[PDB]
Every structure is written in C-alpha cells, then in structure tokens.
Design an enzyme around this catalytic site. Structure first.
Site, mmCIF file in Angstrom:
data_model
loop_
_atom_site.group_PDB
_atom_site.id
_atom_site.type_symbol
_atom_site.label_atom_id
_atom_site.label_comp_id
_atom_site.label_asym_id
_atom_site.label_seq_id
_atom_site.Cartn_x
_atom_site.Cartn_y
_atom_site.Cartn_z
ATOM 1 N N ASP A 128 0.816 -1.215 0.000
ATOM 2 C CA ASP A 128 0.000 0.000 0.000
ATOM 3 C C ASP A 128 0.853 1.270 0.000
ATOM 4 O O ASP A 128 0.825 2.066 0.933
ATOM 5 C CB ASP A 128 -0.966 0.003 1.188
ATOM 6 C CG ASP A 128 -2.045 -1.043 1.062
ATOM 7 O OD1 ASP A 128 -2.414 -1.383 -0.079
ATOM 8 O OD2 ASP A 128 -2.526 -1.533 2.104
ATOM 9 N N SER A 129 1.622 1.447 -1.067
ATOM 10 C CA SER A 129 2.321 2.706 -1.285
ATOM 11 C C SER A 129 2.225 3.091 -2.751
ATOM 12 O O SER A 129 1.710 2.315 -3.554
ATOM 13 C CB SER A 129 3.780 2.609 -0.852
ATOM 14 O OG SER A 129 3.871 2.413 0.540
#
Ligand SMILES: [Mg+2]
Ligand SMILES: [Zn+2]
Ligand SMILES: [Zn+2]
Ligand SMILES: [Zn+2]
Lengths: 49, 400, 44, 64, 57, 34, 257, 117, 330
Positions: free
Chosen positions: I58-59
């Site tokens: 989740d980046s």
C-alpha cells in the site's frame, strides 16, 4: 456507544430507500449514526381535524 | 515498537542509518512481526542513554536474534508480498539469462566470493539459469526437501518420482538448488522451511545476509521481467460462460422441484430435524454444491499467463475463491449464519410476492463482480458485509 | 498606523488607544495595510 | 482555478488553448473535434482541457 | 485508581528521548537497520565519556 | 402517448424536477419554519 | 575492442519536432542520449520574483509559480551566460541574468487579461515566446499587479521548468524479431507505425543471434530552442561530461605514486 | 527545512573528489571505482563499452541507494592487462563515437537547407 | 475548494487545492450536488506495475517532475485570536510593543517585527517561535505577556483584522498562509477505498515510458487488487481512456445495464489501442523493453488531509512539571 448488542447495529430490511446502506463510520460507532438517502423526505405534521 | 504491543516481537532493537526526508524507513520482511502496513501508520523509537543498557539491547533483543519464536517454534519473518511472486517466476525450469544480465545481478550479492560459475548451456552460446544463480544466495551447505503448492498427489506413486514433469519436489542438496520451484511452502514462515533450516544450522548472523541478498537480487531482476494486473486477467472465453449459465440454470431448477414437492406434504423429516430444518438443509446443499463446480469450471479455464493465478499459486496474496467470485459467481449471502430473513412481514423486500422461498429471493447472488450486481443483490451483499464489519470492531477490545 | 475600512476601503490613520471606526462610513471592521519591507520568492 | 500552463505528464504547453477551445465549442464543434483542431493527439494532453473547471470566473464577482 | 497516584504515575509514565512519525518502505536496507530523518537525529543526544582514545574526535 | 424504451432519458428528467424545487436540505428548513 | 560508426538519417523537420533514425549503435548509447534531451540541456527561465503590490485574487506564491513555467527564447545566448554560482559578480549582473518587469492596472469596468505580452525585458535576445499569449491572471476594476524578476540558466535536474522538450518518443525493433517482449495472443495487438510486416502477420520469425539496431526518435520542443539544436546541444553536452571525467581519472592514477 | 536542495544532486562539495580507486583483495586483477555525484546516465554508458572488450572478464555497476548520489563500478581483466587501462580505453572510445555522430548529424540537417525533394 | 468566498472567511484550518478538476467518469447523480463546480481531485495517469519495490504494501511511486508543474499542490491557512481584557483594575491588558527595560517577564526573542500597535503587518515572513502579538499587563510596573507561534510553521502573515467582539473588548484576528508541496509522507487515496502513502519520487528521465513518451504520474502495486476485489477500479481507468480519446465524458451510473466491458473494449480498439488497456512500456534506466505489458490509464485521485509535516515530533530532555517533576509539553 459501546454496547455489544448487535441487533441495534445490523442492517434491517426496512432501510430500503430511506437510509444509505453503505455509508457508516467504523470504530465504536458502527451503525449508530446513519445518513439518509437522496430522495428520502421527512414529514412535518398537520392537524387531524 | 508499534501501537499495540502483543508479543515480544513487537519491540526489537534496530540500528540507525540517516536519510534525507522526514519519515522512518524500514525493510519489508520485518513488517510481519510488527504487523504493520504503509497506509498512514506510526511507530515510536526510544534511545538507550547508558552503555550497559546499550550492551544488553545489543545482545538480547536485536532483530536478527528473534527470527524463530518460542510460541510455535517456527520463524516469524519470511519472504513477503512482492518478492515471493517474483521468486516463483525466477526459478521456473525455463529462465535463461545472458552474460550482461548475469553480471548485473551478481553486482548485488554481498557475500559473493568473486567467481563466475560455468553456464548450463555452453553452446551455441552461454546462458545461465535461474536456479544456477539462486544457488549462490543459499548459505553454507544446507539440505532440505519440500514440495510446491501444485504437486499432484499421484506423482509419488508411478514412475518419474525423481523426475517430476511439472518441476516440483524442491531439493536443496549440499547448498544448491537442484530442482523445484520456490513458493510460500518453502520460503515463508512455516516449520521446516529453508529459512528455518538456515537459522538452525548456520546461525543468526548469516540468515540476515540471506534475507537481504534474496530481496535485492530478485527486485533488480523484476525490473527486467515486470509484473501487472489488468482486466484481460479477469475475463474468460465464450465456452466457459455457457457452462456456468447451464449449471446455474439446472441448480435453480432443482430448487424449484424441492419447493413444489414440499408444498404437497411429501417431505419426511430426519431424526432430530424439524420440517423447516430439513427443507432448508437440502436447499442449502443444492445451492452450495452448485457454486463449487462453477468455481472449478472457472479455474480449469485459466491460462499460464494469467496474473491472478500468478499471485495465488506463489502464495503471495489471494485465495482460490476470489478467482471464482470475480469470474463465475459471487455466491449466497447470509446474516447471523442463516439465510436472509424476512425483514418485512413474510417478505424480504417489497418487490417480491409473499412467502417466496426461491434462491434469488433470499440472497443468492448469481452474477460475478465483473458482470455487476442487480439492486436486490447489492442490498443483500451490503447486509453480509455489515455483519462481517461489526465483528472485527468487537474482537479487538475483547481480546486486549 | 494606517488602517483600511472593511466596506468603503478608505484608508484612515488610527492613533494608539482610540476607538475603532471608519469615517464617511461608520463601520467597525478594520484591516491593517500591507507592509513595505520587501520579501523575495522563487519560481521554484 | 485557472488553466495550467503545462500538461503534467508530457510538458506540452496548454495554457494558451483555453479561449480557442471555448470558441470552437461555441459554433458547433463536438469536444472530440475541437480537440483535434488544436493539435492535442495524446490522451494525456486531452484530459487537460476536457476535465477543467474554471473557478476564476466566479471569484471576479466579489468587489475588491 | 487509574489516574490517581497508585495506578497512573507509578508504573505507567511519559518518558523522554523518544520520537514518532510515519513509516514508509525501503528495500535497500538490511533487516536490522532503520532510517531516521535529520531533524530527529539532530535533536536526540547520547552522553559519551571522554577518554584519551577519543579526545581529539 | 406511452413511453416505450425512451425510459433512460425520461426518468432523469423527473428527478431533475425534484431537486430543482426541493433541494437537499429542505429537511432542516421546513421543521424550523414550523 | 573499439567504437562503432553510427549513421544518422533525418525523416522530418519542422519548427517543433524532428524525426530521425540512428543505425549501427548500441542500446545503452541510444538511451543515454534519450535522457540528455530531457535533463542536461541548459536553458533560460525565471528564478527570482519580488512583488511590490498584488491585489488580485491569487496569492503571491501562486503568481510567482505561474511565471517560472513561461518559456523564454534561449536560442543563441545561452552559451555566453555563466552560472550565477560560478560568476565572480554579486548576486546579479548582466553577465549571468536577464531582468524582467510587469506592471498592470485595471481601470475600465470590463475585466482584463494579464497575458505574457506584459513581461518587458531589457535584453532583446530573451523574450517570452511571442513573435497566442499565455494567461497569468485576470483582474477586476480596482486591482493591480507589479513585480520584478530575474531569469537564470540551468538544466532539468534542478527543476522541471528548465527542460526544453515536450514528450520524447523512442522505440526500436518494431516487430518482435528478438522477442524482448512476449505477447500471450499476438493477434490482438495493433501493428506499429514503423513495421514492415504483411497485413496478415503478427510477428517476424524469431532469430536468436540478433541485436537491437536502428533506433527511432521523435523530439518535440516547447518553444525555447529549435528542435535541431536540442540534439546538437545534447551530444555536445554529453561528450563534455566524459571528457571532464577522464581528467579526474588520469589525475588519480598519476598521483598513485 | 528537512528536504535537501536540488543542487546537491550534481554539485560537488569542497572536500569531495569525483573518483576514487580501491583494489579488490578477493581476486587478482580486480578494481572498484567509485564515481561521486553521478547516476545511471553515465554508469550504464560505461559498462556496455567494457563488455565489448575481449580482454575484460567482469563489468557491472550499481547505485547503492536511489536517495544518495553515488555509483560503483567493478572491473576484472586478464593477467596481462590493467583495470585502470581498460577503464580509460573505454572512455576515449565513447568520445570518438559521440564526436563522430555529431558530424554526421550536422551534415544531415544541412542536407535539406532548401530540401532534397 | 470548500466554498467560493474563502477569501473573507477567517476559518481555522482551511485547506485549498490549486488546480481542481472534474472527473472524466461521472455518475449521473452528481449534477444535483454540485460536484462539477466545487470538485476535489485531479485526473492522474496511473500504471499498475511493480517497478523498484518502493510501492509495496500500500504505497505509491509518483512522478517528481510533474509535482514541479503544479500536481496536487495546495495551500494551508490558519487563524489566531487574541482579546484584550480588563479582568482587574491594575490587571488591565493592552496591545503594545514590549520594551526590554520596562517590561520584565519576556523571553529574549526578537520584538522587531511588531509595529507600534503590537501587531505584525501582513506580508512579512513569520517563522517558528516568532512573537506576533505584543500584549502587556500592568503590575500592581508592567509585566508583559505575548503570543508566540507553534514550532515549524514557516508561514507568511496573510491579513490582520481589528474590531470589537460581542461586547466592548477590542480583539484581533491573524491569518497565516503556508504552501504545501507533496512529499514522501503524504497520503493519497482513490475513489474505491485504496489509501496509501507516497514511497519515493522519480524524475521524468527515470519513469517507464510508452512508445510515444507518456510517463505515468502514479505507480501502484498490483497486489492491492486481488485480495479486496475492487474491480470498479479497473473499469473506470478503461472507461476513462476512451473518454479522453473520443472527447466525451463517461457515464458510470450504477445499475445501467447498457455499458458492458465488451462494449467499452470494442470502442477502444477503434482508436488504435489494445482492447484491454495493456501497453508496452520501456524501462527508464536501461531503455530495454519490459517482458510483460503494463495496464495503464487515467483515474481520479484525491489528496487526503493527513500530511506528514504535522505528525513528526521528538523529545530529548525537555521541560518538566513542577509538582510531580514528570516530563511536560511546551
Ligand atoms: Mg494500517
Ligand atoms: Zn468605511
Ligand atoms: Zn501531455
Ligand atoms: Zn551577475
């Protein structure tokens, strides 16, 4: 805001078209605050005379 | 440490390295102990002031000293989300590298002695293999035997037990990969893995280099190989759709015969079962065994280039039911562990007629996430999701 | 110093410890005038 | 609030094409044809004009 | 009890020499390292005794 | 006189009539005037 | 163990783009000059703004930003300008800068557009690209704007306002003769513009002892430099980087004794 | 201010030196160059040229951290050759290639002063 | 942008985007709640690929030389109140410039920015720990108070207002302006529940490009899709690519049953693209082709309120309390 009883928190069949089914906050206030749908209209009252 | 400290792995001793911008930066294989993820998370650090406390933090709680846990005697750190999918593809039977690429990859090994191994194919031109380069990362001379997650159980019976047409049965002999594809069963956090054996035999200061080398080499090959997910990977051919429609039609048929033979009092309850109970039990049988064969019909039509199967097989992220839910059928919803109740009086919504017991009238969503849901199915899906969302909110406080 | 009315934008010097009102408008919301020491920016 | 001077992805100069774009939609052109009469052929430079909301024309209604 | 003088300031208390901020990934770091910004590192200190081995530095 | 399969543009022309008159916060403004 | 003999061949030439082809070279060299058209070609742009009176709708740092991205004519006098960090003058001098000036006041009732025709310079060699007009701000009756700006010299690693090019196309091997990329179903893919295949084929037959050659370029321009001096100034800039590194190297293995 | 200025990526400081030599002690005839304030634009142009030499056994480069500005190059040659020799012979072959391509280009643009067609 | 007359309102904690844009894929029930006249977001070109490992778990990787052209830039306002009060005969307060020898309780901070009134004129550049309002209390001589900034603001004084509150107590309000450029802690989110921070920023000379020079602004991890099953995210970037090439604006009303995927894909193969969005990308560092084909297209992202400039703090031998001598804030 912390009672563990689920029946005042679950989604009820009668909310069709009058309360949004998807929009609610997480955390400890799940299903306690709710937003009403787009065309839902609340009545204002009158006299039965 | 991270916000809630549950086990002693939630507080470990790191080592400082100073970088330009203004966030804490840490490796990825350590996010499993902390249970962290990078969507607006936060963590604290404390700095030992004395020298005695510095020595005891150094010889007691540094992160390479806490790889295996005494809770279940198995490692807690394994290869993770993005490196696992690539490690599975890097160790296939057919991955050949040229000369320039092999040199570029060897540039990233921190424990390389300085010699280039002899290629597997000397003529017509020199080509190295994936396993031949991976054999340089494996430390010492360790030994291990595992299986890949697609090993057909009927392979150890006949011949080809030590040949394995599908290239399964990982074998690491004298510290070099001889055969087999690597996945979560052989590199993740389970007992008897490769990292577990490397920790038991070699020690705590070589497994660190093992982790780091795996990650760096595989990332610098992945930016040559690439990886993605689209909608071409979420669609099927024309033949499979027809099969799914047919099986759904036949299931919705059988349910109708059951219903209409229960309306003439021709059902016989089973020992310890009310008539309602046996009715709903056999209709649940019909509905549940129906979606399974749709799932199998969706699975057996996938391709080798599919990107869902590539994350499911390597064990990086996903499960074999998400494939069928995206491609074939969402399935049947249920609140409180039972079918959708009669919230109105003898109805579920004002669009049905009273006492309708069919499949579509009580929660069976027969579409897929790619074909979209109809309004009445959208609502039942919302109900199921809501109960699944409340349980998690309760669990944290209770367990703490 | 010098103040600017909130309605008619007519500058009027208000002396220290003095009521806050405009003139020719009778208003009670005043905005201080921009400074005269200069600050430099970057197009970056 | 005001048309950017450069497409965020290419770098091609867009800030001089907003008045000509309104002038072409003024007569009879469709948005698909007005964008071709200006020379925007990559779909990253067409998003610039196709999805722009001009808020500067509503802040000029408040007396200074 | 909690937040009195026996259960709120005897075993659980606020401490100094500590920092807090967001975390972001970095695949180029060893599993035993952490990355610290320069504004936090220029604030926290460490007392170092002077010995004839490290007088000049 | 009936509306056959011109429905997708007809349903969005009565909904426009609703919001052009009522609005979105007539909930609050009508209970106060009462 | 020596270099190659590349050959260039131009296909198009306009005042805003060049199409050419570089045969008989290596892939690493054909890419290292694709990154130089973008980053390391020097150009002029505004880098110092000071506002005297701004009563418009946009705040001061909004206008100071829409000014830097205006492209100035950098055709010939970029080679005579020093870097302001190298020049032996004070903060600014006409040997390493160009001074601009804007001053607009709205008096009529009809609104006023403050275009780039108002940037008035002192050196007639560097002017904004006007020989339409970029819009900076709109003014209402009773508002005004006046400022002073200097325009330095730099390249595209500092800031993305100093790069001279729009999109830079680049591609090689229009048919998978090398199978550098692998199609799952090679029939659904459109045929490239440069392909030489038949109308009923998908890929050329695989040949193992191949090597990428004949790279295709297409360099556009934003308006500062001509599209053919973006290329000449890139090759002359990359050569001068290696030529300077060879000095430092021979200076090291000479001081080894 | 916790963000570096933009000129730190290419502008050398006072104490730094652009290039540094160290000999690798694990194998004979190996060396390890460390160029400072540099990136992939120059790193990759060198490696491809060294591989074209039939007297070079190894050649590669890496940027150890994308948020710092420094590259590393490793070379190994046959026992009758020097890594410092192979390095400088590579550079003089790039320069002999770029200056040649510039002549052939400047001819092609003035090949259509008025136009060939 | 939250309201059109944001110039007059001296709210506290107001955020404003520079260049808002309306979606390219809209629902038909957005014309009635004014989402095309006060929008919040920007259509960015997103690619779903694993590039260098900085967008895992989740980046997002984002283009650095698009941030330099105004991408997702914004501003940040904040207001402060002060009210002079007569709580006592001698304990009367007043706005004035505190002088060192007369007043006594001051710090050694500089008091030159203050004017004769005791307030800062708008236009100056007030940094952390810079006194803005000089208010002296008379001692039963003169014991001064004042108001200082918080730490790490680096604002610019926007405008100063002076008037009278509910009763007859003179009071003033001050607004401080500060510009916020996106950096590698900030939080970005899509329209389908995919939040994520920013991992690193590459220049344009390093992002992967297509065969005509279209680099993506944002790169997200493919592992975010298969576990949470947001397939609505994969169609609006396919529908969005048709809307930019044709010139219309798409339609995403929920229960339409007149827009399949087979009807969108067949529309896309008419403009000369692959009929599922995939494209052939080149590597930015070495110029080589990437063996897989990457799914790329335009999507609508939003910039959440949680920035990293607001969540970093550190303590090392700071001020302590007085009664219990426990560490205290400041
Ligand atoms: Mg989280
Ligand atoms: Zn007045
Ligand atoms: Zn563009
Ligand atoms: Zn000068």
């Amino acid at each position: 805001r912390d009672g563990k009883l689920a029946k005042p928190r679950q989604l009820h069949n009668t909310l069709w078209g009058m309360v949004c089914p998807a929009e609610t906050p997480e955390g400890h206030a799940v299903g306690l605050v709710k937003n009403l749908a787009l065309m839902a209209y609340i009545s204002v009252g009158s006299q039965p005379s | 440490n991270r916000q809630p400290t549950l086990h002693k792995m939630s507080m470990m001793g790191h080592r400082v390295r100073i970088l330009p911008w203004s966030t804490f930066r840490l490796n990825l294989s350590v996010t499993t102990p902390y249970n962290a993820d990078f969507d607006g998370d936060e963590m604290n650090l404390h700095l030992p002031q004395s020298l005695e406390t510095r020595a005891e933090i150094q010889e007691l709680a540094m992160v390479p000293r806490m790889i295996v846990t005494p809770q279940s005697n198995r490692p807690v750190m394994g290869i993770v989300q993005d490196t696992l999918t690539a490690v599975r593809k890097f160790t296939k039977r057919d991955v050949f590298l040229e000369r320039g690429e092999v040199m570029n990859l060897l540039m990233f090994l921190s424990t390389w002695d300085g010699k280039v191994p002899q290629p597997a194919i000397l003529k017509p031109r020199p080509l190295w293999t994936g396993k031949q380069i991976f054999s340089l990362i494996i430390p010492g001379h360790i030994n291990c035997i595992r299986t890949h997650s697609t090993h057909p159980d009927d392979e150890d019976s006949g011949p080809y037990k030590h040949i394995s047409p599908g290239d399964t049965k990982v074998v690491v002999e004298n510290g070099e990969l001889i055969m087999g594809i690597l996945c979560k069963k052989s590199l993740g956090t389970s007992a008897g893995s490769l990292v577990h054996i490397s920790y038991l035999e070699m020690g705590h200061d070589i497994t660190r280099l093992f982790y780091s080398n795996i990650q760096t080499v595989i990332n610098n090959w992945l930016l040559i190989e690439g990886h993605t997910i689209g909608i071409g990977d979420s669609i099927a051919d024309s033949k499979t759709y027809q099969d799914i429609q047919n099986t759904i039609k036949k299931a919705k048929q059988d349910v109708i015969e059951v219903i209409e033979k229960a309306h003439n009092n021709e059902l016989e309850p089973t020992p310890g079962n009310t008539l309602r109970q046996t009715f709903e039990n056999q209709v649940n049988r019909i509905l549940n065994d129906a979606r399974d064969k749709t799932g199998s019909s969706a699975q057996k039509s996938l391709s080798e280039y599919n990107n869902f199967k590539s994350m499911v097989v390597s064990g990086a992220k996903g499960s074999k039911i998400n494939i069928s839910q995206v491609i074939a059928v969402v399935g049947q919803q249920n609140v409180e562990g039972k079918r959708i109740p009669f919230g109105f009086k003898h109805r579920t919504l004002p669009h049905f007629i009273k006492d309708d017991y069919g499949p579509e009238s009580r929660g069976f969503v027969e579409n897929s996430y790619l074909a979209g849901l109809t309004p009445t199915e959208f609502f039942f899906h919302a109900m199921g999701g809501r109960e699944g969302l409340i349980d998690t909110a309760v669990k944290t406080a209770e367990t703490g | 110093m010098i103040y600017i009315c909130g309605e008619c934008h007519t500058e009027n010097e208000i002396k220290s410890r003095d009521p806050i009102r405009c003139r020719e408008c009778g208003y009670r919301i005043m905005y201080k005038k921009r400074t005269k020491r200069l600050v430099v920016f970057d197009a970056r | 609030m005001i048309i950017p001077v450069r497409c965020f992805t290419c770098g091609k100069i867009v800030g001089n094409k907003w008045e000509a774009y309104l002038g072409l939609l003024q007569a009879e052109y469709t948005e698909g044809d007005a964008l071709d009469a200006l020379g925007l052929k990559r779909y990253c430079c067409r998003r610039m004009l196709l999805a722009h909301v001009d808020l500067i024309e509503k802040l000029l209604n408040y007396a200074p | 009890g909690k937040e009195g003088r026996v259960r709120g300031n005897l075993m659980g208390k606020r401490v100094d020499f500590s920092a807090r901020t967001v975390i972001t990934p970095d695949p180029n770091l060893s599993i035993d390292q952490v990355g610290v910004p320069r504004s936090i590192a220029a604030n926290m200190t460490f007392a170092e005794i002077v010995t004839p081995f490290n007088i000049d530095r | 006189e009936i509306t056959p399969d011109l429905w997708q543009e007809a349903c969005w022309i009565v909904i426009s009539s609703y919001f052009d008159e009522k609005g979105l916060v007539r909930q609050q403004l009508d209970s106060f005037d009462e | 163990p020596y270099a190659n003999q590349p050959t260039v061949r131009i296909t198009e030439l306009t005042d805003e783009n060049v199409k050419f082809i570089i045969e008989n070279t290596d892939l690493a060299v054909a890419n290292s000059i694709r990154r130089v058209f973008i980053a390391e070609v020097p150009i002029i742009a505004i880098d110092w703004v000071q506002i005297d009176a701004n009563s418009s709708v946009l705040h001061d740092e909004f206008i100071a930003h829409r000014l830097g991205l205006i492209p100035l004519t950098s055709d010939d006098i970029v080679d005579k300008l020093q870097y302001s960090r190298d020049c032996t003058c004070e903060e600014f001098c006409p040997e390493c800068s160009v001074e601009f000036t804007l001053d607009v006041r709205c008096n009529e009732d009809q609104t006023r557009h403050v275009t780039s025709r108002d940037l008035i310079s002192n050196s007639p060699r560097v002017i904004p690209v006007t020989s339409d007009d970029i819009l900076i701000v709109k003014l209402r009756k009773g508002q005004e704007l006046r400022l002073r700006a200097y325009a330095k010299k730099g390249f595209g690693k500092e800031h993305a306002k100093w790069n001279p090019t729009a999109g830079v196309a680049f591609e090689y091997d229009p048919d998978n003769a090398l199978r550098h990329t692998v199609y799952p179903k090679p029939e659904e893919w459109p045929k490239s513009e440069y392909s030489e295949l038949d109308e009923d084929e998908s890929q050329a037959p695989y040949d193992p002892n191949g090597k990428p050659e004949r790279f295709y370029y297409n360099v556009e321009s934003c308006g500062s430099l001509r599209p053919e001096t973006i290329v000449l100034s890139a090759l002359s800039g990359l050569k001068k980087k290696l030529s300077d590194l060879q000095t430092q190297l021979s200076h090291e293995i000479q001081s080894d004794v | 201010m916790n963000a570096p200025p933009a000129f730190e990526s290419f502008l050398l400081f006072e104490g730094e030196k652009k290039i540094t030599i160290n000999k690798d002690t694990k194998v004979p005839n190996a060396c390890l160059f460390t160029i400072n304030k540099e990136d992939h634009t120059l790193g990759n142009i060198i490696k491809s040229q060294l591989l074209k030499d039939p007297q070079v056994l190894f050649a590669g480069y890496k940027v150890p951290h994308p948020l710092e500005h420094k590259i590393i190059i490793r070379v190994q040659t046959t026992p009758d050759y020097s890594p410092q020799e192979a390095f400088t012979n590579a550079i003089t072959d790039l320069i002999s290639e770029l200056s040649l391509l510039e002549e052939r280009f400047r001819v092609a643009i003035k090949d259509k002063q008025e136009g060939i067609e | 942008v939250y309201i059109t007359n944001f110039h007059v309102r001296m709210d506290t904690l107001a955020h404003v985007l520079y260049y808002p844009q309306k979606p390219l894929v809209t629902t038909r029930s957005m014309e009635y709640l004014r989402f095309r006249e006060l929008p919040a977001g920007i259509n960015s070109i997103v690619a779903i690929a694993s590039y260098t490992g900085y967008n895992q778990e989740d980046s997002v990787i984002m283009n650095r030389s698009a941030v330099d052209r105004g991408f997702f830039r914004s501003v940040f306002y904040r207001s402060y109140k002060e009210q002079e009060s007569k709580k006592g005969f001698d304990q009367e307060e007043v706005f004035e410039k505190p002088t060192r020898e007369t007043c006594q309780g001051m710090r050694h901070a500089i008091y030159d920015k203050l004017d004769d009134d005791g307030l800062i004129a708008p236009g100056v550049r007030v940094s952390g720990d810079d006194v803005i309002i000089g208010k002296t209390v008379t001692l039963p001589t003169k014991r001064d108070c004042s108001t200082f900034l918080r730490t790490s603001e680096t604002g610019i004084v926007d405008q100063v207002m002076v008037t009278l509150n509910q009763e007859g107590y003179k009071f003033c309000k001050i607004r401080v302006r500060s510009v916020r450029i996106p950096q590698i802690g900030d939080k970005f989110a899509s329209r389908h529940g995919q939040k994520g921070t920013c991992g690193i920023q590459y220049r344009q000379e390093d992002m992967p490009f297509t065969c005509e020079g279209i680099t993506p602004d944002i790169i997200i991890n493919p592992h975010a899709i298969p576990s949470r099953m947001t397939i609505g995210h994969l169609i609006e970037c396919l529908q969005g690519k048709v809307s930019a090439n044709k010139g219309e604006i798409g339609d995403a009303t929920p229960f339409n049953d007149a827009v399949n995927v087979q009807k969108i894909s067949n529309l896309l193969s008419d403009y000369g693209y692959h009929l599922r969005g995939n494209e052939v990308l080149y590597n930015g560092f070495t110029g080589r082709k990437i063996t897989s084909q990457i799914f790329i297209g335009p999507t609508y992202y939003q910039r959440l309120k949680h920035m990293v400039d607001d969540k970093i703090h550190s303590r090392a031998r700071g001020p302590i309390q007085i009664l219990n001598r426990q560490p205290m804030e400041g």
